[PDB]
Symmetry: D3
Subunit: 266 residues, 6 copies
Amino acid sequence: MFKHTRKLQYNAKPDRSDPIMARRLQESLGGQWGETTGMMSFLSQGWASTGAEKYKDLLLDTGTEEMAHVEMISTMIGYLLEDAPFGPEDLKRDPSLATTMAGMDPEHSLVHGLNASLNNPNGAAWNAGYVTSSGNLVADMRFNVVRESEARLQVSRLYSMTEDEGVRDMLKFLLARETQHQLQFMKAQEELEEKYGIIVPGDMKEIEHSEFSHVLMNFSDGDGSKAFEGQVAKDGEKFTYQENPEAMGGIPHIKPGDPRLHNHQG
Amino acid sequence: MFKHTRKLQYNAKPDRSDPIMARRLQESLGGQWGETTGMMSFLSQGWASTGAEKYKDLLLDTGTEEMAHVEMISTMIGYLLEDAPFGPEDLKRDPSLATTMAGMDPEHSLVHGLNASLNNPNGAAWNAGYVTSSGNLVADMRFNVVRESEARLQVSRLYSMTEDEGVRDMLKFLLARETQHQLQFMKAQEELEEKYGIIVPGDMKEIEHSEFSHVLMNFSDGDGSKAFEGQVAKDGEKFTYQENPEAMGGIPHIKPGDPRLHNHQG
Amino acid sequence: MFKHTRKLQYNAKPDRSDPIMARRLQESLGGQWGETTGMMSFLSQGWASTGAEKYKDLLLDTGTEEMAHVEMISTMIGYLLEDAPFGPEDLKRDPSLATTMAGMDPEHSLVHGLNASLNNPNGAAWNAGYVTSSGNLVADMRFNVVRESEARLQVSRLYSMTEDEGVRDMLKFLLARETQHQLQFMKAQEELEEKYGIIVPGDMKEIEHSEFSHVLMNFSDGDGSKAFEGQVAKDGEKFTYQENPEAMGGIPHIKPGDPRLHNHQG
Amino acid sequence: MFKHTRKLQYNAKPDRSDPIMARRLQESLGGQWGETTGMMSFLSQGWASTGAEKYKDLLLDTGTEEMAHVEMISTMIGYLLEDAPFGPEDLKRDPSLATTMAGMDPEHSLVHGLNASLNNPNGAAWNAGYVTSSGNLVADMRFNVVRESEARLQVSRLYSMTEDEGVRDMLKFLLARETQHQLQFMKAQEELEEKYGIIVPGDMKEIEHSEFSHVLMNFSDGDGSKAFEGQVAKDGEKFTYQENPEAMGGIPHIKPGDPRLHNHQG
Amino acid sequence: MFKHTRKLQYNAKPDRSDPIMARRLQESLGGQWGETTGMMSFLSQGWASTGAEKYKDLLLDTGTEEMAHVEMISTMIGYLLEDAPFGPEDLKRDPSLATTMAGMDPEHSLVHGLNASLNNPNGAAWNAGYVTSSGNLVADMRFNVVRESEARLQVSRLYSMTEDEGVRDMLKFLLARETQHQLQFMKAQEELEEKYGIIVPGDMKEIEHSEFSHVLMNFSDGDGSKAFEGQVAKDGEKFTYQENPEAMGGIPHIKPGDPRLHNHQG
Amino acid sequence: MFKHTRKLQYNAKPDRSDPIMARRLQESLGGQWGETTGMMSFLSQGWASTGAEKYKDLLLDTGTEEMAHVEMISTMIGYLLEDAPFGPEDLKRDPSLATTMAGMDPEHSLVHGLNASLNNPNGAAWNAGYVTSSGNLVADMRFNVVRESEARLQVSRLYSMTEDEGVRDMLKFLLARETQHQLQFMKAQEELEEKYGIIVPGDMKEIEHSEFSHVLMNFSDGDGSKAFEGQVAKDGEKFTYQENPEAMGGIPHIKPGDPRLHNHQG
Ligand SMILES: [Ca+2]
Ligand SMILES: [Ca+2]
Ligand SMILES: [Ca+2]
Ligand SMILES: [Ca+2]
Ligand SMILES: [Ca+2]
Ligand SMILES: [Ca+2]
Ligand SMILES: [Mn+3]
Ligand SMILES: [Mn+3]
Ligand SMILES: [Mn+3]
Ligand SMILES: [Mn+3]
Ligand SMILES: [Mn+3]
Ligand SMILES: [Mn+3]
Ligand SMILES: [Mn+3]
Ligand SMILES: [Mn+3]
Ligand SMILES: [Mn+3]
Ligand SMILES: [Mn+3]
Ligand SMILES: [Mn+3]
Ligand SMILES: [Mn+3]
Ligand code: NA
Ligand code: NA
Ligand SMILES: [O]
Ligand SMILES: [O]
Ligand SMILES: [O]
Ligand SMILES: [O]
Ligand SMILES: [O]
Ligand SMILES: [O]
């Protein structure tokens, strides 16, 4: 179960309004790699785990934290939308606001009354297709590192998309929390790799066709990738290199379907 | 530019038909972590890179290979759908086929004439929201490892969802290629981390609020995560642990909107 | 069955072109609470009803009217897009048009030839996820009131997003029709509530766990909601108030899955 | 900010496994009117409100409670998926399990390792298009009543879709909470209607074309809706009835577009 | 404007219930090439046209007819869902119904109360991405023929998916209407091609790089397409054939981006 | 299987940067009728064909070619995004860039690091709902002609949306290839129509209700469509015309559902 305090985890107030930045920050709220993705991924993985409490609790700790970040971004967006222009009265006051209006999300005003959406900057709804919870935490801890890496990349970009020190203060906090989250998930990932194996899943080495497991296949005519040849892979075996990959599976010949399908193909 | 040969990269023919397995394999064709996701992610990242040829070429090599896998899965599904039941004539032949029909994707027959879709097993269309190309390859190589990890997990599951040795032959090849792909992307990842930093992006350490960068914050009441306390993180600094995270940001108070918005909130 | 007349239900011509307003009006055409949502919701509900003709006919009447509104908005958008700028030749005759171009939907010209789309202002396609038809008209009449409420709110906002008297004339008609629709659906709702109950569905009072049915649970630390304590709810029973809700369900412990799933969780 | 306890708000454990019921319950987790919709709608409205604390706090209290329900449904699904059949070895044990397998969501096993998804029963991802936060709480409290009405309908149906008394115990709790939520939102709605008006928004009566505001227009040839004629609407004015609605707007003619668009229309 | 009669265009009543067929028929209601696609495509194109009345009226005629077909399919689905099984009481009545339940759409009962949805058989929502209205009727009449072709193919398949004579009666009517619609759109198409050109758009022959306009480029190693070599194309010019297409564009190199983007690519 | 060369099929470098044009060109990369739609449609149809080699090879040839076009558009977008403005430093340098920034896709910088997305200009993800592969090549070749027609229309429009002769050079090549593709698919279509019939599918004429197969039904009150009366349709039979279409199916009456559904409809 959860409980809520009205107090934010950390400052989420800008020095001044900026509806263009509000639109950008929709990426962090409703985007592919945003806080809602973190929240739902870590919570769902956490609820699904039947294994080590170290990792189950880490996931629930972090997913709960991400809910605080969802709250923070939603709040920042609301502040940033204060006094945003949306109609003729605004243009009469200052005709240059047309530029601002053009760069805004039309739905911020029209749909939400100058409040945050749960979409990205382009109005694409957040969706669960952004979430991963597979049941395998070697894989999912890798995913969690990625989530925090792509997110911190975006936050770092956002930092260079404003000069507002209030917005930056919030971003600087999130950068630090994303460092922590990257690191904690990397530690979990490494412990899980040590237990189960470096290849995911770790218990299929005897099943796969081993002859092809360490061959770098040169499908594009650049030769940059030849530099991997002879390097030691993370499992201790060297990469080999195949200059000209071969087509080994023959030409397929699927059977024409039943006439009731009307598959008229010549 | 690309060229195509009709010969498959590797065998993609089953020993017998099975439209239920065809439906499962749609995950590998049109699903979140399937071959189309790999193909489009690695190619888009490859085309976007302005950096080291070692990695640009690796991405284009692999994206091109994934197109061969898309072809293989599409082919396997077509073979698996041969003679699949879809109407009363089939039930006249064998009434027990109603069970098979119930488990099939209705659109395999109706929409596609007993051929593959570009959807997942539940008819959800593949979409570009599954794809990541961020411009940062430290982040994106991590993503690529994840893609290959989730895919290999799914392929491993699929192996236990059939007894068809022809299907399994294809799966065993893909398991191996996914091993190679996981490993090559891990090597690239590690080299990029060595160059730019273990935290993504690596050039923000002096900007983030460092005091919060290594603190494990206990938001859920389990104590499993306390095991991380005092462990050395990948950047060489130890994690600290906060049993009771603090709300430091105050209670927000956003300015009510302009009356033209009709934001009647009491 | 339907028949069509080329005459619009009401005026839908703007006094002047304005492609930015065209973009805003896409909300009323292809948006979540737009006219297409009303049309499809009321017709689907109407076709699904097996109950009182008073309500079935109301739904079909209204859904049919909403098709006229879809036609009007589509028409208005087309007029608003007349002579809109879309390339270098336009800027040559008026360089100030760059600002207009920046705020336009690129697809209005490129995809549709300066005609309406069936997307919202952000380009997100209308979809049936916006539509409700549940089989229960106590629930669905409530939905219908909401549809007309959200729509009228948006129309009211649009009224303040233009000074075009032609656009406003159409909007003033839509405001009035949305008043009628809100009121007719409110009357239907109330009659249905009188027949079936104020709680939806009205025939489960003896099944639910009654002890929790009138308790306001204070999950957020604000005390505003305490003002509901002792107030008489619509079913005639007072609300009680629980300042500190309790977790009553225990800590779950789901069983680890079969090894074939490779659920490596530590 | 939020905090989490591992203890569930209320029991969420079935007496027996049942992966078909697991699939149904996905509606309550990832569906249109499910607990995630509640959680995100109430939290987003709550964060966006600048109005009376009575309602802002109510929203935050309830959105936080709905997170507990998301947790419960996710947990219930996990339990229900225990030991579910997913491959040939299950059929070897009991060939009759083919029926169960046919009815399952293939991704429960393949994608999630026999854990919950964030999709509906058909694998359609939850998305933010299900959420409303408009800025107007007269409209949005109506929405919230709908949310809880449609949800309670679905929970009532679910009660008749199982005989598992553990599942039913959870459902009975949710029915009761949905009663409370329906009622509290209805009270809020009524107080806000008193303050602002029964028509949303309540401050446009002088703007709308009043002649059309209380006319029931008979667009479908059934005569059931004529029963509204003469009834007193909720604003105190009687409905009138128009048996034969008229097309008042003329036949529109948009100008042909610029030749650079190539709008060849004959 | 539109008016509605309760009378269906043509019979849409089955002899018997069949919830599996109901699910199939959702393709015709909510699917990619179904009646809602026809309705919205032909109406949107019709409203958009500024050209010949012959075609504008044809589009509005047919779009209006498609609304009748949306009504028919919606109705047929409702009838087909009568008495459909959805819970333990049905299995007590007839345990063999488990098979039927497994093949049904879970949301038909749970969400819609055994009524139609506006989704396809897999629960994917109808969306406007299925609609085309481009402003060019040479293109769009081609699209309209495709819509009616794909639809008639599906209806033909549906005919072999049931033996119900009532269902078949409806299908036989739809087949015939789809014949008419294919033909009328083909005639419009041809007239428009005669006016504007066989290539769309017809007024760019002097702009394109003509040298590459009639060359069949053999990008895949099969030789079947060489049969086009020397055949006369529809514009009266012969196809030529290139066995080995050439890459003429060079190897691109984009400039590395601003460091504020953190594009760390090696 | 596929192989790749770094060399582009044809020039894809603009003379100069233009991030607004980059946004437009996203229609050709990730849009409904763009190159990814061609690529995936032609390849999937190719892989699914069991019919004449002429057509199967054509589809594989062309789908492979479209992959080169995907590469080209991706590359062109990357070049066009060079030096695009994205933050305060750019505005400090040149305040006039705010107009450009307002018209850009915010995600070009924030998500992709000034590289291409796989979305349309409005950020809507490319999805497989854009792709058709039905199993019937009479229908699908019609679809392929449409794809190339809509694409060539958009490319033609793009030509008038820039003065950059580098961009135009690429567009001029694509116009020519779209001519060839339109023509080759038209030729295939015509051969297939001669083999199977002009109506799709061609083997249903004795099943359909022939009395309705050549009647133009006047559902909209314009009389432009009466011009088709007496014209000879493509199958050799004249169209007839019905001024007043009749509703022949009666008023439906579906049975009220089981009480366990709670279908309270009055
Ligand atoms: Ca290479
Ligand atoms: Ca903890
Ligand atoms: Ca409270
Ligand atoms: Ca009526
Ligand atoms: Ca060839
Ligand atoms: Ca007519
Ligand atoms: Mn965060
Ligand atoms: Mn984080
Ligand atoms: Mn692969
Ligand atoms: Mn791979
Ligand atoms: Mn309306
Ligand atoms: Mn209305
Ligand atoms: Mn709840
Ligand atoms: Mn609730
Ligand atoms: Mn039709
Ligand atoms: Mn038709
Ligand atoms: Mn092309
Ligand atoms: Mn082409
Ligand atoms: Na505000
Ligand atoms: Na019924
Ligand atoms: O975070
Ligand atoms: O792979
Ligand atoms: O309306
Ligand atoms: O709830
Ligand atoms: O049709
Ligand atoms: O093309």
